[PDB]
Amino acid sequence: AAAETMTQDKMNPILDAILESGINTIQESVYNLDSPLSWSGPLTPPTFLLSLLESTSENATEFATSFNNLIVDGLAHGDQTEVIHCVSDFSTSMATLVTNSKAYAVTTLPQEQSDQILTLVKRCAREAQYFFEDLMSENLNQVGDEEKTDIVINANVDMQEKLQELSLAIEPLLNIQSVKSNKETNPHSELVATADKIVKSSEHLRVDVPKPLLSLALMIIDAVVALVKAAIQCQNEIATTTSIPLNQFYLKNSRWTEGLISAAKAVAGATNVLITTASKLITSEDNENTSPEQFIVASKEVAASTIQLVAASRVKTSIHSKAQDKLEHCSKDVTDACRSLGNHVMGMIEDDHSTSQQQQPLDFTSEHTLKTAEMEQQVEILKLEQSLSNARKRLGEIRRHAYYNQDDD
Amino acid sequence: AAAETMTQDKMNPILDAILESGINTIQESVYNLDSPLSWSGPLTPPTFLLSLLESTSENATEFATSFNNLIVDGLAHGDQTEVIHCVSDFSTSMATLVTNSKAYAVTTLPQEQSDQILTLVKRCAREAQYFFEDLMSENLNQVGDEEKTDIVINANVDMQEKLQELSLAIEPLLNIQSVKSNKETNPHSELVATADKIVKSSEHLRVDVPKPLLSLALMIIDAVVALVKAAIQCQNEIATTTSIPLNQFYLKNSRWTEGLISAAKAVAGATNVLITTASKLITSEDNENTSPEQFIVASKEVAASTIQLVAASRVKTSIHSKAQDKLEHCSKDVTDACRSLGNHVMGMIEDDHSTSQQQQPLDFTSEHTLKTAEMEQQVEILKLEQSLSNARKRLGEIRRHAYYNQDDD
Numbered sequence: 001a002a003a004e005t006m007t008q009d010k011m012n013p014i015l016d017a018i019l020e021s022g023i024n025t026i027q028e029s030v031y032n033l034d035s036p037l038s039w040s041g042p043l044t045p046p047t048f049l050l051s052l053l054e055s056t057s058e059n060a061t062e063f064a065t066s067f068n069n070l071i072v073d074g075l076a077h078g079d080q081t082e083v084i085h086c087v088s089d090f091s092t093s094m095a096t097l098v099t100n101s102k103a104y105a106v107t108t109l110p111q112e113q114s115d116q117i118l119t120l121v122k123r124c125a126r127e128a129q130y131f132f133e134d135l136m137s138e139n140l141n142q143v144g145d146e147e148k149t150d151i152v153i154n155a156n157v158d159m160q161e162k163l164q165e166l167s168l169a170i171e172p173l174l175n176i177q178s179v180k181s182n183k184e185t186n187p188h189s190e191l192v193a194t195a196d197k198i199v200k201s202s203e204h205l206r207v208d209v210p211k212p213l214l215s216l217a218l219m220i221i222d223a224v225v226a227l228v229k230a231a232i233q234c235q236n237e238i239a240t241t242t243s244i245p246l247n248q249f250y251l252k253n254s255r256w257t258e259g260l261i262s263a264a265k266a267v268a269g270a271t272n273v274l275i276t277t278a279s280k281l282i283t284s285e286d287n288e289n290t291s292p293e294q295f296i297v298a299s300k301e302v303a304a305s306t307i308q309l310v311a312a313s314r315v316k317t318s319i320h321s322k323a324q325d326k327l328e329h330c331s332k333d334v335t336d337a338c339r340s341l342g343n344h345v346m347g348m349i350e351d352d353h354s355t356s357q358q359q360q361p362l363d364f365t366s367e368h369t370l371k372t373a374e375m376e377q378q379v380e381i382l383k384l385e386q387s388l389s390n391a392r393k394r395l396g397e398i399r400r401h402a403y404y405n406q407d408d409d
Numbered sequence: 410a411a412a413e414t415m416t417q418d419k420m421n422p423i424l425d426a427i428l429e430s431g432i433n434t435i436q437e438s439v440y441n442l443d444s445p446l447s448w449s450g451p452l453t454p455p456t457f458l459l460s461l462l463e464s465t466s467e468n469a470t471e472f473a474t475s476f477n478n479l480i481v482d483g484l485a486h487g488d489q490t491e492v493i494h495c496v497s498d499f500s501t502s503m504a505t506l507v508t509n510s511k512a513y514a515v516t517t518l519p520q521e522q523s524d525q526i527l528t529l530v531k532r533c534a535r536e537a538q539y540f541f542e543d544l545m546s547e548n549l550n551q552v553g554d555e556e557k558t559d560i561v562i563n564a565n566v567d568m569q570e571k572l573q574e575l576s577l578a579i580e581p582l583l584n585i586q587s588v589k590s591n592k593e594t595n596p597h598s599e600l601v602a603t604a605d606k607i608v609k610s611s612e613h614l615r616v617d618v619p620k621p622l623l624s625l626a627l628m629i630i631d632a633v634v635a636l637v638k639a640a641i642q643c644q645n646e647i648a649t650t651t652s653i654p655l656n657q658f659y660l661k662n663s664r665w666t667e668g669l670i671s672a673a674k675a676v677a678g679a680t681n682v683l684i685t686t687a688s689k690l691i692t693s694e695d696n697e698n699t700s701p702e703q704f705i706v707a708s709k710e711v712a713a714s715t716i717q718l719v720a721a722s723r724v725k726t727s728i729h730s731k732a733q734d735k736l737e738h739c740s741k742d743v744t745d746a747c748r749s750l751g752n753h754v755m756g757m758i759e760d761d762h763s764t765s766q767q768q769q770p771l772d773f774t775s776e777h778t779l780k781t782a783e784m785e786q787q788v789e790i791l792k793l794e795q796s797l798s799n800a801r802k803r804l805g806e807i808r809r810h811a812y813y814n815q816d817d818d
Binding site for chain 2: 013014017018021024025027028031034035036037038039040041042043044079080081084085088092096273293294296297301303304307308311314319357359361362363364365367369370371373374375377378379380381382384385387388390391392394395397398399401402403404405406409
């Protein structure tokens with residue numbers, strides 16, 4: 001029909017521009033990738049990264065779905081706000097996957113295996129560029145009217161093959177510990193239980209005369225429980241935003257579900273090592289033991305795992321939630337508290353080690369000695385990046401080999 | 410106006426969705442920022458980062474200009490492709506600034522000074538959110554018709570105050586090699602001269618019988634000159650895209666200009682240290698003295714500086730240039746060659762050091778000892794990240810204290 005064609009023709013250029021802005025939104029992340037100015041990125045876990053592969057597939061299917069609805073309504077006649085949201089969410093989630101999976105691959109795997117994964121992430125990123133590019137309007141303009149949906153579904157299935165082959169490249173990485181605890185128990189109840197696990201452990205921790213360092217630890221713990229009580233309310237607001245029971249929701253999203261439980265168990269476990277450390281700072285009043293670095297480690301471990309809990313709690317909400325806002329603000333309370341505790345103990349260390357951490361002047365009159373001195377210096381920043389990328393995987397094996405005994409312990 | 414009113418019910422909501430997709434394009438980078446998982450990254454110079462501050466200001470002024478033109482053509486009736494490009498370019502360049510300036514601050518500065526810069530990058534990012542937020546058309550439904558341009562220009566000037574105060578936070582970081590003077594000599598002629606500096610130095614090296622390790626270095630140098638000759642065509646593609654003379658172009662963009670010259674001098678200087686290492690041929694046929702790590706440093710230094718030259722060559726374009734494509738592809742030739750030379754020399758080292766780089770099993774049958782062994786591990790990845798963040802600035806002070814002499818010599 002006429003108006004269906006004429007209003008579509010006016011909005012086809014803008015749809016081309018939005019799509020090309022989509023390609024650019026991805027392409028700016030690929031420029032970023034192949035620039036090694038980007039360096040040592042996220043210690044992102046595979047459990048989360050599978051929920052990105054899944055939510056990518058869902059958003060790609062939502063982009064296909066909303067494109068099919070817009071094909072039936074005439075490719076730019078109908079209201080694009082849904083497609084522009086779905087493009088913008090698929091493009092932002094794909095661009096977040098492409099970012100994250102490079103960071104993850106390069107920081108975790110041996111040479112051939114890292115090289116192998118990146119090659120396929122690139123093919124997936126290019127195939128997503130082909131998803132917008134094999135449409136635009138230029139490539140589509142002559143193709144039969146419904147038949148465009150076969151380009152959509154073939155581009156979908158080939159992308160989904162690359163996502164499945166990418167999935168089959170990440171699935172072999174999963175940890176064995178979940179095998180003995182496949183259960184219907186749900187993360188909501190684990191958070192509700194986590195509150196009591198902490199509170200029953202910390203009932204001990206309200207003596208009649210406090211100490212400076214201890215009080216900061218209580219400010220953390222008290223903020224962490226407030227954060228967990230926010231996290232209890234987060235899912236409950238999702239259960240009212242969604243139109244279906246918690247069981248009918250949880251029974252599909254298994255890869256997100258395991259991410260949220262592993263996050264809840266990381267906050268429980270993290271806080272338990274904080275509480276287990278703070279116990280030394282109350283169960284003796286006398287200075288029988290000290291361990292400042294252990295606090296800096298442990299405070300950074302609560303600070304890192306609490307950020308994973310927000311991120312793992314984020315993926316399923318649009319932002320306007322007061323439970324999200326309260327969780328985020330409470331995470332700033334935890335962040336600032338860990339920063340304060342950090343600054344305090346760093347202060348106690350550097351009170352002495354201002355003697356140790358000194359430097360000497362660097363000027364020279366003879367040019368040969370400058371052109372040499374930088375070529376001395378660039379070799380030290382090699383040995384002390386290899387050492388860090390070498391020892392950071394020995395942890396990833398202590399994460400596995402002993403923990404398969406920890407399943408039975 | 411009439412057509413402005415008739416389009417409002419459909420076309421304001423989509424413009425709101427595009428703007429909110431703009432806020433989200435930024436907000437995804439701020440969620441990224443305040444997730445420390447998006448960790449220590451780009452070593453990028455202030456010279457480049459000022460061209461981002463400038464091109465942000467120009468794109469912000471182009472978002473102002475194109476929205477002012479749209480305010481005259483009818484607030485959502487007119488062809489939005491220009492505004493949607495300018496929003497998409499301001500949003501991608503701002504999001505790239507917010508990313509890069511966090512990376513730069515945390516990698517370079519002391520505690521107070523890094524804390525200080527990030528605080529203001531956040532205020533600038535929020536003020537940009539307030540800019541699109543103030544254009545979320547609920548605000549423009551109550552402000553007087555032309556008077557919206559005062560919200561635009563006040564939001565602009567306050568952002569520009571934050572960008573100027575941010576600029577004044579980065580300008581104190583600049584260096585003597587251009588702080589002494591700007592000149593009329595231009596980068597085009599420095600590239601043209603760079604070709605001859607390299608070719609006249611490398612006329613020596615080509616001899617009747619080659620060697621394996623040397624041939625790879627000639628593949629680099631030959632690719633690097635091809636890359637520099639591509640870079641000569643890059644500016645002609647800019648200068649023919651523009652209507653104005655090279656002098657009328659160069660006399661404005663001084664911060665970009667110094668970025669491109671310092672990049673060209675980095676590719677000349679990088680290649681000259683590679684050619685100086687191949688000039689270890691000059692003394693002898695026999696191995697008088699050599700070392701491998703010098704090549705790994707130097708090949709990574711050509712590989713890093715050549716990526717800066719492409720990036721510094723991107724900013725003033727659109728992607729469809731054959732000179733851009735040729736430069737990028739040639740940079741892949743250089744990248745792959747450096748990777749090949751890397752792999753070769755790494756191979757020569759590990760042929761021996763397979764003796765050194767060995768590991769032992771990590772399993773345990775006592776939970777206390779596992780829970781301890783991971784807490785032994787987490788402190789080593791502290792000592793060997795402080796050491797790296799400590800020594801990486803003892804280089805950055807050699808960029809000045811001795812280098813002011815070499816900048817004059």
